[PDB]
Amino acid sequence: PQYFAIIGKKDNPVYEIEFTNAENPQGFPQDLKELNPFILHASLDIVEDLQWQINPTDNCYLGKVDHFYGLAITAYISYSGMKFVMIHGNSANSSVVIDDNNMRSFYQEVHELYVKTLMNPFYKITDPIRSPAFDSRVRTLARKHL
Amino acid sequence: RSQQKSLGRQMKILGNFQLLAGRYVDALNSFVDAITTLYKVRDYLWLGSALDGISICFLLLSYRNSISIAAMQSPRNSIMSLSAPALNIDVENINLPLLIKCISDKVLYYYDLSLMHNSEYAPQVVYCEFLLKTLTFMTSCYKSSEFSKDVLDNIVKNQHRALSDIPNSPMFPRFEVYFYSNKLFELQLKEMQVEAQIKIYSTMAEVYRLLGYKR
Amino acid sequence: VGPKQAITSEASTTYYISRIYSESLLFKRQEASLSAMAFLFQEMISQLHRTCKTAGDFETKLSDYGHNIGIRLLELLNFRASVSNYITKMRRRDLKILDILQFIHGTLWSYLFNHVSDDLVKSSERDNEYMIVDNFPTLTQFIPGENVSCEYFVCGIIKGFLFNAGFPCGVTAHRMPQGGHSQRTVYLIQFDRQVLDREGLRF
């Protein structure tokens, strides 16, 4: 039950995906639509007024940031413009587990997959990525760190 | 405990009665019918302050857990109203600061600081209302909620300190822990009454639109 | 993850390593001749004097190439300088204006032209305007620069180094022979008022 988003500068999602553990075998039935953009839209609000200041030396990674009344969110800000958001958590428990360093070895690790696709000179900014390979790569890159 | 209950009901009723019946609108001051109040132009809740001081002292000596935060609500309303608006630099809150020393949240000497401190104190006392299991305000005695009074408690908190962070940062600023300290609706909030939900979401939306946090 | 489609996918209980094209991205060194890249720039400016009407639209239709690749050079130049990829860390972002126009001064020119532009002068009369002078510009040294319209490759390339950085900015070039160094070009840049006022909240 994990939900990835890359959300752009003018609020566009350049890459957004879910996946599920087969131990859950589905994901957030009837909660999968409120845990989407509106929560993430407010997450854009809090990283909008959290990036530009020094202080709430690792300016990119930020860890767990906020919490609605069912789960809690994490974040990452790149200087490319983009703001990576993973949304994780089994829906039964309040999932506390922020690994905070091994999933820090996801955000700097998915960053180059965004880099090499950005370096495609046919690829513009403010348009999403239907790579058939880079989206099959990231779930297997999430097979490293569940 | 019967003396504690008798003093609790009498002190809560007397605190609210002499609060609302002193300086309700005192800019013309019709001095006839001076039975229940002084009611002159210099009558701004002074006997209400003395009565609320004795009421909070007897409430702390009563030792409630549910109704006892209304004493802190009475003292906080006293130090807000009669020591902010029609104060005229009197601010007679010596036994209020003594109750702040006794029960909770002493050691403050400013506007918008001791009010926040006593609001945290009354919130902690209403958190210490673990299980009253009775009916006190008898509008509802079987289908009622401690949720339905606690949402009014912290929205009194939210309206009375969220405006102090002026949208224009330079004027009167503090840290933006208003959203951080606003995420406190862990309760269920599934339709006790629809107008409570409407005023709670109107104020919760309006403060985010005030602080420029649109999303 | 199409725009038309939803964010829908499948479970994690397999392993699809069927991948095609992903490689290294490191600082390679191949170092082609200045005549070759000069001919590339040469026939590019020939196309732009062919297809475009007058001065200012040609200036914009030159600076758009810099806006195409300025974002691209920004993010991995920062990913190489302030950081396969057995990564220690990624360091600090733009704090203000004066570290990020130090970052053109520090390691953009030495990424491109193997030296450093000689000054990064904060202006006298105002603060929205800033000015960097290159002393002997490398990629336009053959063009007789009496028209200064030919150096708007690099005004376009630094504007796309600051438009990602959140400082929208009027960027111009002038040329002024203040020294025995001849044909040195000043890139007097500007900003807008608002991120100057975001700097002007606290400095």
* Closest among A6, A2, A146, A3 to A76, alpha carbons compared: A6
Element (H, E) at A75: strand A73-77
Phi, psi (degrees; rounded to nearest 5) at A66: -150, -175
State the SS3 of chain C: CCCCCCCCCCCCCCCCCCCCCCCCCCCCCCCCCHHHHHHHHHHHHHHHHHHCCCHHHHHHHHHHHHHHHHHHHHHHHHHHHCCCCCCCCCCCCCCCCCCHHHHHHHHCHHHHCCCCCCECCECCCCCCCEEEEECCCCCCCCCCCCCCHHHHHHHHHHHHHHCCCCCCCCECCEECCCCCCCCCEEEEECCCHHHHHHHCCCC
Best C75, C91, C95 member to test A by mutation, with max A CBs in 10 Å, is C75
The beta-carbon neighbor of A69 closest among B179, B185, B213 is B185
- Cβ neighbours of residue C203 closer than 8 Å, sequence gap 6 or more: none
Residue bearing tokens 């028209």: C147
* Closest among A81, A87, A83 to A64, alpha carbons compared: A87
Beta carbons of A42 and B185 less than 8 Å apart: no
Q: What is the largest CA-CA distance in chain B?
A: 54
What single letter denotes the amino acid at residue C11? A
* Residue B73, number of CB atoms within 10 A of its CB: 23
d(CA C82, CA C111): 13
Edge-to-edge order in the sheet of strand A83-87: A13-19, A2-7, A83-87, A73-77, A61-66
Residue bearing tokens 């790149």: A78
d(CA B77, CA B19): 9
- Cβ neighbours of residue C64 closer than 8 Å, sequence gap 6 or more: C156
CB C70 within 8 A of CB C96: no
Q: Which residues of B128-153 are buried (b: 16+ CB within 10 A; e: fewer)?
A: ebeeeeeeeeeeeeeeeeeeebbbeb
Which chains share 3+ C-beta pairs under 8 angstroms with A?
A: B, C
Q: Using alpha carbons, list the distances in angstroms from residue B168 to A35, B204, B211.
A: 32, 20, 9
CB B125 within 8 A of CB B76: no
B194-210 and B147-161 helices, crossing angle to 10° = 20
- Our CA angle for C134, C139, C145, nearest 5°, is 70
Alpha helices (H) in B21-113, listed in sequence order:
46-62, 69-81, 95-102
CB B65 within 8 A of CB B125: yes
Q: Considering only alpha carbons, which residue of chain B is nearest residue A40?
A: B215
Element (H, E) at A74: strand A73-77
Beta carbons of A44 and B215 less than 8 Å apart: yes
* Residue C50, number of CB atoms within 10 A of its CB: 7
Look up residue C75 and give its two tokens. Answer: 């993010």
CB A46 within 8 A of CB A65: yes
Handedness of CA C165, C168, C174, C178 (dihedral sign): negative
Find chain A residues with C-beta within 8 A of C77's C-beta. Answer: none
d(CA B104, CA B120): 9
Beta carbons of A18 and C75 less than 8 Å apart: no
- Cβ neighbours of residue C86 closer than 8 Å, sequence gap 6 or more: none
d(CA B64, CA B61): 9
Q: Considering only alpha carbons, which residue of chain A is nearest residue C2?
A: A130
Q: Is A47 exposed, middle or buried (0-12, 13-18, 19+ CB in 10 A)?
A: buried
C152-162 and C55-81 helices, crossing angle to 10° = 50
Find chain A residues with C-beta within 8 A of C1's C-beta. Answer: 13, 15-17, 128-130, 135
Cα atoms found within 13 Å of the Cα of residue B186, Cβ hemisphere only: 6
Does C79 contact chain A (CB < 8 Å)? Answer: yes
CB C133 within 8 A of CB C187: yes
Look up residue C172 and give its two tokens. Answer: 């111009």
The beta-carbon neighbor of A116 closest among C22, C87, C92 is C22
Q: Number of helices (H) and strands (E) in chain B: give both, helices first.
A: 7, 0
Domain count, chain A: 1
Beta carbons of A49 and B183 less than 8 Å apart: no
What is the domain extent for residue A85? 1-146
What single letter denotes the amino acid at residue C41? F
d(CA B213, CA B67): 36
Resolution (A): 4.2
- Our CA angle for A55, A57, A60, nearest 5°, is 80
Does B186 contact chain A (CB < 8 Å)? Answer: yes
Cα atoms found within 13 Å of the Cα of residue B142, Cβ hemisphere only: 0
CB A27 within 8 A of CB A20: yes
Distance of CA B106 to the CA centre of its chain: 16
Alpha helices (H) in B21-169, listed in sequence order:
46-62, 69-81, 95-102, 114-127, 147-161
- Cβ neighbours of residue B200 closer than 8 Å, sequence gap 6 or more: B151, B155, B189
Find chain B residues with C-beta within 8 A of A52's C-beta. Answer: none
d(CA C154, CA C135): 14
Method: cryo-EM
- Our CA angle for B26, B31, B32, nearest 5°, is 135
- Cβ neighbours of residue C50 closer than 8 Å, sequence gap 6 or more: none
Q: Is B21 exposed, middle or buried (0-12, 13-18, 19+ CB in 10 A)?
A: middle
Grouping H, G, I as helix, E, B as strand and the rest as coil, residue A102 is: coil
Phi, psi (degrees; rounded to nearest 5) at C91: -75, -170
First and final CA of chain B: distance in angstroms? Answer: 51
Residue bearing tokens 């549910």: B66
Grouping H, G, I as helix, E, B as strand and the rest as coil, residue A97 is: coil
Does B214 contact chain A (CB < 8 Å)? Answer: yes
Find chain C residues with C-beta within 8 A of A5's C-beta. Answer: 7
The beta-carbon neighbor of C72 closest among A3, A13, A119 is A119
Q: Kindly compute the dihedral angle of the four CA atoms of residues A92, A104, C163, C97, in this order, to the nearest 10 degrees.
A: 120
d(CA B166, CA A109): 41
The beta-carbon neighbor of C2 closest among A21, A81, A128 is A128
d(CA B4, CA B58): 8
